[PDB]
Design a binder for this molecule. Structure first.
Ligand SMILES: *[C@@H]1O[C@H](CO)[C@@H](O[C@@H]2O[C@H](CO)[C@@H](O[C@@H]3O[C@H](CO[C@@H]4O[C@H](CO)[C@@H](O)[C@H](O[C@@H]5O[C@H](CO)[C@@H](O)[C@H](O)[C@@H]5O)[C@@H]4O)[C@@H](O)[C@H](O[C@@H]4O[C@H](CO)[C@@H](O)[C@H](O)[C@@H]4O[C@@H]4O[C@H](CO)[C@@H](O)[C@H](O)[C@@H]4O)[C@@H]3O)[C@H](O)[C@H]2NC(C)=O)[C@H](O)[C@H]1NC(C)=O
Ligand SMILES: *[C@@H]1O[C@H](CO)[C@@H](O[C@@H]2O[C@H](CO)[C@@H](O[C@@H]3O[C@H](CO[C@@H]4O[C@H](CO[C@@H]5O[C@H](CO)[C@@H](O)[C@H](O)[C@@H]5O)[C@@H](O)[C@H](O[C@@H]5O[C@H](CO)[C@@H](O)[C@H](O)[C@@H]5O)[C@@H]4O)[C@@H](O)[C@H](O[C@@H]4O[C@H](CO)[C@@H](O)[C@H](O)[C@@H]4O)[C@@H]3O)[C@H](O)[C@H]2NC(C)=O)[C@H](O)[C@H]1NC(C)=O
Ligand SMILES: *[C@@H]1O[C@H](CO)[C@@H](O[C@@H]2O[C@H](CO)[C@@H](O[C@@H]3O[C@H](CO)[C@@H](O)[C@H](O)[C@@H]3O)[C@H](O)[C@H]2NC(C)=O)[C@H](O)[C@H]1NC(C)=O
Ligand SMILES: *[C@@H]1O[C@H](CO)[C@@H](O[C@@H]2O[C@H](CO)[C@@H](O[C@@H]3O[C@H](CO)[C@@H](O)[C@H](O)[C@@H]3O)[C@H](O)[C@H]2NC(C)=O)[C@H](O)[C@H]1NC(C)=O
Ligand SMILES: *[C@@H]1O[C@H](CO)[C@@H](O[C@@H]2O[C@H](CO)[C@@H](O[C@@H]3O[C@H](CO)[C@@H](O)[C@H](O)[C@@H]3O)[C@H](O)[C@H]2NC(C)=O)[C@H](O)[C@H]1NC(C)=O
Ligand SMILES: *[C@@H]1O[C@H](CO)[C@@H](O[C@@H]2O[C@H](CO)[C@@H](O)[C@H](O)[C@H]2NC(C)=O)[C@H](O)[C@H]1NC(C)=O
Ligand SMILES: *[C@@H]1O[C@H](CO)[C@@H](O)[C@H](O)[C@H]1NC(C)=O
Ligand SMILES: *[C@@H]1O[C@H](CO)[C@@H](O)[C@H](O)[C@H]1NC(C)=O
Lengths: 674, 49, 99, 489, 95, 194, 99
């Protein structure tokens, strides 16, 4: 299908049965072409070499569309040299720290070569260029990530496969910082991939370690760079490229008790690296005890249920249990779901949340008023927000807690059934995916998908896109777009795992065109270009933001803070009305105003006014059809332990010498040999 | 490259002139040329009145 | 709008001279043969001064016409007195800031 | 649907927590319900109704009722008038005796200066950082409304609210009638009294500028409640069960209120329209009142009278509600709901977005006639000494079609003279012309444009407020607030 | 100096003010006129005498302006005399 | 200062109480006594009011009167006075502040502009002021003055009308009657207020 | 996507062209600051006109030329597209002199 006139177009396949019609929105754009890069890693110099050219997605080769190319095609080469003649050059710009890298001249084949350090601290990068157009067409910037290459395991012959129980839905877990490195557990095999499942390598176990029945009861998996963790029948096993050693009491876990484990979900790499202290990378739970796994895979018990029973003033001899633990967006905090019986003898149980703070090593009890039956199992996740806002599900429903545990309830359809099994032919919830922008996708084992927006209660049932019997999963590509992965055995081993993208935004726009919702503001801009701000005694932070909205619907910019308040704000506001649009422009400044001169307990006051806090900016009222990403950042006060002083002309080891020894006497404040 | 800006001076044409003061009347200015060139652009406009 | 633009003459690197005609004390305001001849002579001398400023010795002041109007500008007011009251020359007032 | 969507706030009831109140509860002494808002510490507020709630937050969480700990014999615990002094202290008037309450601690203090039973405590609060108006917020008056002036005792204090000493009766010897209030009118640096000689009432001033003077008399059926606008511009609102009046001056002219309907205005008499007002909320520039037959009126109060319109219908009145201005252009209806299962009160809130609600086609209000009004004279306060002058500036962009007339006014024209120039420079990218207006201010005597009856002394200090406003601003110009500042000579 | 602000489409190349001088023989008039970004027009006029000798009128007319405008034609008068306020004084210094 | 910005209302009504004229404009006459003029703010209520005046004299705002000529500009300030007793604004100017000469010559009229503030001109109202002791034509007696009902019987004989101006100051025209030859007499009427 | 300003350099190894953007939504304004700098190559020391290298830069709004006509009195003008010639060498009108 081709067309040139813009707008919305209604397309429909007329067939024997009833097929729904779809509205596709097409708009004119002056951005047409794209960047393509290929990396190579050299470890002797600890560096990366990237090669970049320009390609057009309409007239490209087949390889350049699936990211498997090494040499530019004829169209890409000709386009690259034509845009080089007009004066276009790409440069790579690191995001966390603002350093730029420039290319050399164009080589014999169309290729710009840029050299780059290996960082592991600033892994987010953009690749950009000048404002040079070819024939009224631009090139779009490209966002990407790269770190040290991560090796996937190899397979020795004679090993045995590890499977999920028969008939159970296949599961997937990926790395928290760099995606396209994931492990998928199925009913017949376990796969691991260094890309988005283009090439894959199986994961197996040495003979004799586990029984055949045990090999078919894998409950959960988790994936790190060092190795993989399996939860086989309530026992945690560790698979590394060397051995398949089983965790026991010698490493701080119990046997045949473990119910689950979890890792971090948001890539807070910068604060974790700059912390200069190794913290936990995993948390496990066994229905009566939470454990906090550090690196090298050994851990001490975090908390038993008796201490929490003492904390919650409970009248003792009560059935108090744990069901899930998650790492929220605060980098040094955890949350745990607490199931409470209340003199039992019924099927109804209370669900509460207890928050554990590691900086202060304390516990807090929150506001939850949720009753649930015994049979329900719960899984909850934290959204991209400074404040704790959870999305929780129990394989028939989805409950929500928004705006600091005030807006708590059940997510419902516009009809109001509130049961997602009745709209999905009686199938249970299989997967829930959150993202940075704020959109959640709920997928059942029937392969039907619902959509939720954060801070929005109503759900939207999306149109059917995939079959009923297909064995699928949902994942993310190199960018943060959704992709559906089809798995089918009885094939030629080259098509057992096929990935196709899912255009979620277009389907949402079609649904909205059917419905008729709208975004109440025209625009919301800010200058928060980062996530981690650090500042010393004598500095302040200036944050700028602006809303442009229709004529007199009274809006404003809500600033929300979480953590320890150690600062002050001053906000200045400007209001303008022009051409039927109002504009509200706000500048806010963060500063500290304490004096340490001639005071007692200088170090105690210095410690009392240090730490981190979290801020988020958002518009006053918003709904769907708003593609704004809500800015969330953190400010820490304290020294980074990487800044110091040096006298000029001096250095550690530019001047080579040997050992010295000398005696000093009669001039100290008797005989010193040093 | 050189510019020169001038203002044209009125002058009466010598003829019969049946009337007393005014008759055929024109505006005159010198034509200056410098050594090293053969091409001159001459832009005429009004003084605003 | 094309705003914040550099100056035309400075960017294109052109020198510019101004030469206005000498005034007349005739009641109607017309010129004649001799007044136009004086205009031609003054414009010629201005261009000759421009072309003769290629001297390799630096003068204290720019604007080569400074060498022209230096020994005569000490008594400009007197000249005006002779022209306003019509007691001078052919009723021609040769200004000094006009060339 | 329209107006508000209700939302309940309740916390602290997650488990079986045993919390119980202790002592005799506090209740208001009038049928109406009020929300008194502290000026700069805007989070702290007091809801006075059938039960009294003192909140440190913006009426978030659940609040236990304020209670008297019975260590001191208050008798019947009825609050008649509350005030906020500078600090962490609030002043109540219970059973004719003044009391102070600290809400950061739990300390009650008995005010010992007052001897005769009083019924109202009045005073002004400045909230600019410094030590000048920290002293200005320490002069407090204590009086009994409805007493006979020859005979009754009026108290005053200058040390915040620690000790109350008696104020001499020689000043009010010639004044006859029943008093309806004595006020520290810091707008004109005066002390005003409100006299009720007959069914009409009037204001009498004390200090030498207009000493032994009077204002234009107004009707005084029954008693009245007087509300000061909190920016020392002199604006006053006087309201009771069956009337409402607005004083644009410092009490010199007290007039009625207009009402807008189908772009014609009519004077609004409460009694003749057969309505009863229940709650009144007052911002720096705005006014709003809720009428007991489920009605909400919103009005802009300024010079050249006030304009009050009727907002669209919504069932807000529930025997306990009270409006309070959460923010400029954001009204809030707050209703406490009891709970005996946990012995605590949770809250129901509507946030009314008045700017959007003033956009219906049924009302059809012509939009804002000024596009931009901006200055940097609102952040701080200014001082003038003798033989010195100061300059202020403001930038105004008007609408594409209309022709609005700016105006600068002074609270105290006896001790503050100004000259304002408005000149045009440049114009914006659309084509509208920017206007810059600069005001030069100095002492009124040095200008020379006043009689000896008007200048009123030069050896004493005074305070005044300078206001830049638009004379013919319409309604629905909610966010384009007029500029005002405090200038101390 | 005068400024002209347009309420509708203006004449961009052509200056919108046409000026005539009644007696060009006694008065020397030099005008400058420029346009602005929003097509506002700024013009300034310098007026001096010619020699020792009357009066004249200078007329600025908005030719494209309508006949319902309040002010279309501006007519300053220039007199080549001395004002009634032009005298000479001698301060004696004793006061 | 914009010429066609738009003036459509007359906010002020000022009178000198010496000679009454049409209320639609403000015409003032200067004699050997002081020019003493009382002015008030005209609104939807055309009568004077003690409320709007007290509203204006509480922000330090008093009217200003600008007298202008073909060669002269002068400003005169009303005094700020308590609103306790008055109803209208009042100002008296000695004659010597405007003109010091008292001879008979050709003197122009003056244009008067009343406003609430000078630089921040908000409520402008226009009018005229005429000198009476220096006007040449007003010193003479033209002829015998016809009373009423002596000009009403003149109406069926009139055939045409003529007017004059006295170029320097208008509003002092003479209106002359051209009549049928059945009647006899030179008939000229005089105006002082246009 | 909607309103873009694009540049184009001839011989881009001797000229650096950069564009800075600013956007105001209520006023409907987009300010574009275009800075052209020399890259210190592509000429040699000479005499006024002996070492002049002629380049250019083209500046266009995307989609503009041919469709946008500014209509004034006495005609209309094609807009949205400009070609600027640039002469890199040493400019005429510079001398050295004995102080
Ligand atoms: C528009 O409207 C304005 C309104 O003001 C009008 O302005 C007025 O124009 C008048 C011209 O007709 C001006 O009159 C001139 O006044 C001169 C003296 O001015 C003095 O100024 C002093 C400081 O301000 C002031 O103190 C003084 O006060 C007076 O002094 C008199 C003594 O001179 C005295 O009698 C008065 O009682 C009063 O105390 C003055 O105001 C005069 O010199 C001038 O010409 C004289 O005229 C008289 C009588 O005709 C004659 O006897 C005398 O000789 C002068 O004639 C000539 O004087 C010049 C010097 O100026 C000599 O060189 C000659 O040889 C002659 O002798 C005239 O009267 C008036 O001042 C001015 N008002 C203001 C406020 O500026 C405009 O003219 C109007 N415009 C139009 C177009 O109509
Ligand atoms: C419910 O919905 C599910 C979702 O679709 C259904 O799952 C489907 O099951 C089918 C069988 O059960 C699968 O069909 C098989 O597909 C194999 C794929 O082979 C390769 O296919 C790609 C692309 O496939 C199609 O291409 C067209 C082209 O326009 C697309 O438009 C279309 O959308 C679809 O994607 C081809 O491009 C390949 O050709 C070559 O690929 C090379 C890459 O390796 C490339 O380099 C080269 O240049 C060529 O392009 C392949 O053709 C077929 O091969 C299977 O056919 C069999 O193949 C074997 C081996 O070749 C033959 O020996 C044999 O005779 C037979 O031909 C088979 O058709 C289907 O893929 C799968 N859906 C998806 C999305 O994976 C489910 O079945 C549904 N359930 C019910 C009950 O209906
Ligand atoms: C870190 O070490 C690597 C080791 O490979 C360095 O890569 C090498 O860089 C040199 C220098 O450019 C390359 O040599 C020459 O490069 C030019 C580029 O124009 C090319 O034209 C020549 O033909 C020649 O190759 C060399 O090829 C390259 N190595 C490889 C394998 O490509 C890298 O430069 C080092 N980085 C830093 C910052 O020191
Ligand atoms: C988001 O919601 C949480 C949950 O209510 C808020 O935490 C609450 O914070 C207040 C103030 O810090 C705590 O009040 C405490 O009261 C005791 C006396 O009762 C006092 O001694 C303490 O000093 C403190 O003031 C309250 O306990 C706490 N709630 C819980 C469950 O811990 C939080 O403030 C909310 N966030 C925002 C931005 O409003
Ligand atoms: C082009 O360049 C030539 C050469 O400089 C200029 O011609 C020269 O002009 C000067 C003065 O106009 C002549 O000097 C005079 O020569 C006469 C005749 O001998 C003598 O009587 C004077 O005392 C004075 O020396 C000079 O001879 C003449 N050169 C030649 C070769 O004829 C010419 O003016 C330049 N063109 C323009 C348009 O300026
Ligand atoms: C304040 O003093 C002024 C003085 O000018 C009083 O003005 C009076 O005005 C009337 C009418 O113009 C005159 O008849 C009086 O003679 C003036 N009084 C004096 C003392 O000259 C003004 O009335 C006074 N105001 C008050 C309230 O006393
Ligand atoms: C009080 O007012 C009278 C006039 O009403 C005045 O004479 C007296 O001086 C004033 N006294 C004071 C103290 O202001
Ligand atoms: C008239 O002039 C005198 C002398 O300067 C001045 O005192 C007086 O105030 C003036 N009159 C007015 C009304 O300004």
């Amino acid at each position: 299908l081709h067309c040139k006139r813009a707008g919305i177009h209604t397309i429909k396949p007329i067939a024997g049965n009833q097929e729904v019609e779809r509205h596709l929105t097409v708009d004119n754009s002056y951005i047409c072409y794209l960047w393509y890069f290929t990396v190579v890693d050299v470890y002797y110099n600890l560096s990366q070499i990237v090669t970049i050219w320009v390609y057009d997605p309409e007239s490209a080769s087949t390889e350049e569309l699936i990211w498997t190319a090494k040499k530019p095609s004829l169209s890409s080469r000709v386009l690259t040299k034509q845009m080089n003649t007009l004066g276009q050059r790409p440069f790579i710009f690191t995001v966390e720290k603002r350093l730029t890298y420039h290319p050399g001249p164009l080589t014999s084949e169309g290729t710009w070569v840029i050299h780059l350090p290996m960082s592991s601290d600033d892994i987010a990068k953009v690749i950009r260029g000048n404002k040079v157009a070819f024939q009224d067409c631009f090139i779009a910037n490209l966002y990407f990530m790269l770190t040290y290459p991560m090796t996937i395991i190899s397979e020795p012959p004679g090993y045995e496969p590890l499977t999920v129980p028969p008939g159970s839905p296949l599961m997937l877990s990926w790395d928290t910082c760099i995606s396209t490195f994931a492990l998928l557990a199925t009913d017949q095999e376990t796969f691991q991939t260094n890309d988005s499942f283009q090439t894959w390598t199986r994961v197996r176990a040495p003979p004799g370690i586990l029984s055949d029945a045990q090999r078919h009861s894998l409950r959960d998996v988790i994936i790190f760079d060092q190795g993989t963790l399996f939860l086989v029948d309530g026992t945690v096993y560790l698979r590394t490229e060397d051995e398949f050693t089983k965790l026991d009491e010698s490493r701080g876990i119990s046997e045949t008790g473990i119910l689950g484990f979890s890792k971090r979900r948001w890539c807070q790499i910068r604060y974790l690296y700059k912390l200069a202290s190794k913290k936990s990378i995993l948390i496990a739970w066994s229905k009566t005890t939470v454990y906090a796994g550090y690196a090298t895979f050994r851990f001490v018990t975090l908390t038993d249920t008796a201490k929490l029973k003492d904390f919650l003033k409970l009248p003792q001899t009560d059935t108090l249990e744990v069901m899930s633990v998650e790492y929220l967006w605060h980098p040094l905090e955890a949350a745990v779901l607490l199931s409470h019986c209340s003199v039992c003898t019924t099927n109804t149980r209370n669900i509460r949340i207890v928050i554990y703070s590691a900086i202060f090593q304390t516990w807090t009890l929150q506001d939850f008023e949720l009753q649930l039956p015994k049979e329900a199992i719960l899984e909850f996740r934290f959204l991209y927000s400074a404040m704790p806002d959870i999305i929780m599900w129990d394989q028939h429903h989805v409950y929500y807690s928004y705006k600091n545990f005030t807006v708590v309830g059940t997510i419902s359809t516009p009809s109001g059934e509130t049961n997602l099994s009745s709209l999905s032919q009686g199938s249970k919830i299989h997967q829930v995916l959150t993202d940075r922008i704020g959109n959640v996708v709920v997928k059942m084992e029937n392969n039907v998908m619902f959509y939720i927006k954060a801070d929005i209660t109503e759900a939207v049932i999306l149109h059917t896109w995939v079959n009923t019997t297909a064995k699928t999963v949902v994942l993310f590509d190199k960018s943060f777009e959704v992709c559906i992965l089809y798995y089918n055995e009885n094939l030629d081993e080259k098509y057992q795992l096929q990935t196709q993208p899912y255009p979620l935004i277009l389907e949402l726009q079609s649904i909205n065109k059917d419905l008729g919702d709208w975004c109440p503001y025209l625009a919301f801009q800010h200058n928060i270009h980062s996530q981690f701000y650090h500042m010393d005694k004598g500095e302040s932070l200036t944050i700028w933001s602006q809303i442009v909205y229709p004529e007199n619907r009274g809006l404003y910019i809500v600033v929300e803070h979480y953590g320890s308040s150690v600062m002050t704000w001053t906000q200045n506001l400007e209001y303008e009305i022009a051409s039927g649009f109002c504009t509200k422009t706000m500048i806010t400044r963060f500063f500290q105003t304490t004096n340490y001169e001639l005071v007692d307990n200088y170090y105690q006051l210095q410690k009392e006014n240090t730490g981190l806090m979290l801020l988020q900016f958002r518009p006053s009222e918003f709904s769907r059809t708003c593609l704004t990403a809500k800015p969330v950042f953190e400010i820490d006060v304290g020294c980074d332990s990487s800044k110091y002083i040096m006298v000029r002309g001096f250095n550690k080891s530019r001047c080579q010498r040997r050992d010295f020894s000398y005696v000093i006497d009669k001039e100290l404040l008797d005989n010193l040999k040093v | 490259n050189v510019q020169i800006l001038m203002e044209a001076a009125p002058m009466r044409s010598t003829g019969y002139c049946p009337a007393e003061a005014m008759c055929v009347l024109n505006w005159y200015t010198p034509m200056p040329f410098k050594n090293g060139s053969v091409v001159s652009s001459v832009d005429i406009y009004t003084n605003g009145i | 709008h094309l705003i914040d633009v550099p100056k035309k003459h400075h960017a294109s690197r052109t020198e510019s001279y101004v030469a206005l005609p000498p005034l007349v004390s005739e009641s109607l305001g017309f010129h004649n043969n001799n007044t136009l001849a004086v205009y031609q002579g003054l414009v010629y001398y201005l261009l000759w001064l421009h072309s003769k400023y290629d001297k390799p010795y630096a003068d204290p002041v720019h604007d080569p016409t400074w060498r022209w109007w230096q020994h005569k500008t000490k008594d400009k007011d007197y000249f005006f007195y002779l022209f306003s009251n019509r007691l001078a020359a052919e009723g021609i007032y040769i200004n000094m800031n006009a060339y | 649907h329209t107006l508000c969507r209700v939302h309940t706030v309740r916390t602290g009831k997650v488990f079986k927590s045993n919390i119980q109140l202790q002592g005799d509860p506090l209740f208001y002494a009038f049928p109406n319900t009020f929300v008194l808002k502290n000026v700069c510490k805007a989070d702290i507020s007091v809801y006075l109704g059938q039960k009294v709630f003192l909140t440190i937050d913006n009426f978030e969480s659940s609040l236990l009722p304020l209670t008297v700990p019975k260590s001191l014999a208050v008798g019947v615990p009825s609050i008649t008038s509350a005030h906020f002094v500078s600090g962490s202290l609030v002043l109540f008037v219970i059973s004719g005796k003044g009391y102070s309450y600290d809400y950061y601690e739990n300390t009650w203090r008995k005010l010992e200066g007052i001897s005769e039973p009083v019924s109202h405590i009045s005073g002004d609060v400045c909230c600019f950082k410094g030590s000048f108006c920290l002293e200005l917020s320490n002069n407090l008056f204590a009086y009994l409304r409805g007493g006979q002036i020859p005979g009754t005792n009026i108290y005053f204090s200058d040390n915040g609210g620690f000790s109350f000493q008696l104020m001499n009766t020689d000043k009010l010897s010639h004044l006859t009638g029943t008093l309806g209030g004595i006020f520290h009118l810091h707008s004109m640096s005066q002390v005003g009294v409100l006299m009720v000689e007959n069914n009409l009432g009037t204001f009498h001033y004390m200090e030498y500028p207009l000493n032994h003077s009077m204002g234009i008399a107004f009707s005084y059926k029954n008693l009245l409640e007087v509300i000061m606008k909190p920016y020392q511009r002199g604006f006053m609102v006087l309201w009771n069960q069956k009337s409402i009046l607005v004083s644009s001056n410092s009490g010199q002219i007290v007039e009625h209120v207009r009402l807008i309907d189908q772009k014609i205005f009519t004077d609004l008499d409460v009694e003749h329209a057969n309505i009863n007002i229940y709650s009144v909320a007052s911002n720096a520039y705005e006014l709003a009142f809720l009428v007991a037959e489920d009605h909400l009126y919103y009005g802009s109060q300024s010079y050249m009278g006030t304009y009050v319109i009727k907002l669209p219908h919504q069932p807000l009145w529930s025997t306990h509600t009270s409006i309070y201005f959460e923010d400029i252009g954001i009204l809030q209806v707050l209703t406490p709901v009891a709970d005996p299962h946990f012995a605590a009160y949770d809250f129901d809130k509507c946030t009314v977005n008045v700017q959007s609600s003033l956009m219906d086609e049924k009302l059809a209000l012509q939009p804002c006639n000024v596009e931009l009004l901006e200055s940097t004279m609102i952040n701080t306060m200014f001082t003038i000494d003798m033989n010195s002058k100061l300059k202020l500036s403001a930038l105004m962009i008007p609408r594409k079609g209309e022709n609005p007339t700016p105006l600068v006014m002074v609270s105290n024209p006896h001790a503050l003279g100004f000259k304002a120039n408005l000149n045009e420079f440049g114009n914006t990218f659309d084509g509208n012309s920017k206007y810059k207006l600069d005001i030069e201010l100095k002492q009124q005597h040095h200008w020379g444009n006043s009689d000896f009856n008007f200048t009123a002394s030069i050896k004493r200090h005074a305070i005044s407020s300078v206001t830049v406003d638009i004379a013919d601003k319409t309604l629905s110009c909610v966010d384009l607030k007029p500029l005002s500042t405090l200038i101390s000579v | 100096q005068f400024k002209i602000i347009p309420k509708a489409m203006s004449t961009f190349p052509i200056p919108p003010v046409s000026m005539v001088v009644g007696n060009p023989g006694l008065v020397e008039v030099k005008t400058q006129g420029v346009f602005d970004l929003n097509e506002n027009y700024y013009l300034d006029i310098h007026v001096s005498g010619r020699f020792f000798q009357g009066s004249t009128s200078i007329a600025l007319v908005l030719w494209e302006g309508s006949s319902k405008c309040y002010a279309i034609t501006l007519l300053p008068t220039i007199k080549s005399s001395c004002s009634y306020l032009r005298t000479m004084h001698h301060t004696p210094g004793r006061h | 200062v914009i010429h066609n910005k738009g003036k459509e209302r007359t906010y002020f009504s000022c009178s000198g109480e010496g000679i009454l004229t049409g209320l639609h404009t403000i015409k003032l006459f200067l004699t050997m006594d002081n020019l003493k003029v009382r002015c008030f703010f005209r609104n939807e209520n055309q009568s004077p009011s003690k409320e709007i005046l007290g509203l204006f004299t509480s922000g330090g705002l008093a009217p200003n009167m600008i007298i202008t000529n073909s060669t002269f500009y002068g400003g005169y300030y009303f005094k700020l006075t308590p609103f306790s007793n008055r109803l209208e604004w009042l100002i008296d100017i000695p004659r010597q502040n405007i003109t010091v000469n008292t001879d008979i010559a050709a003197v122009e009229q003056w244009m008067i502009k009343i406003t609430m503030h000078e630089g921040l001109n908000i409520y402008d109202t226009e009018g005229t002021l005429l000198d009476l002791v220096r006007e040449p034509i007003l010193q003479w007696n033209l002829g015998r003055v016809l009373t009423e009902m002596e000009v009403r019987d003149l109406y069926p004989e009139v055939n045409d009308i003529k007017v004059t101006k006295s170029p320097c100051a208008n509003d002092v025209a003479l209106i002359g009657f051209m009549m049928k030859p059945s009647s006899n007499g030179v008939f000229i009427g005089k105006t002082i207020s246009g | 996507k909607k309103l873009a300003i694009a540049v184009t350099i001839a011989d881009p190894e001797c000229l650096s062209v950069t564009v800075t953007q600013d956007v105001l939504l209520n006023r409907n304004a987009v300010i574009n600051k275009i800075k052209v700098i020399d890259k210190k190559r592509c000429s040699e020391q000479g005499m006024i006109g002996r070492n002049i290298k002629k380049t250019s830069m083209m500046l266009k709004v995307l989609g503009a030329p041919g469709n946008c006509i500014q209509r004034t009195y006495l005609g209309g003008i094609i807009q949205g597209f400009k070609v600027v010639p640039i002469f890199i060498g040493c400019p005429p009108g510079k001398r050295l002199a004995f102080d």
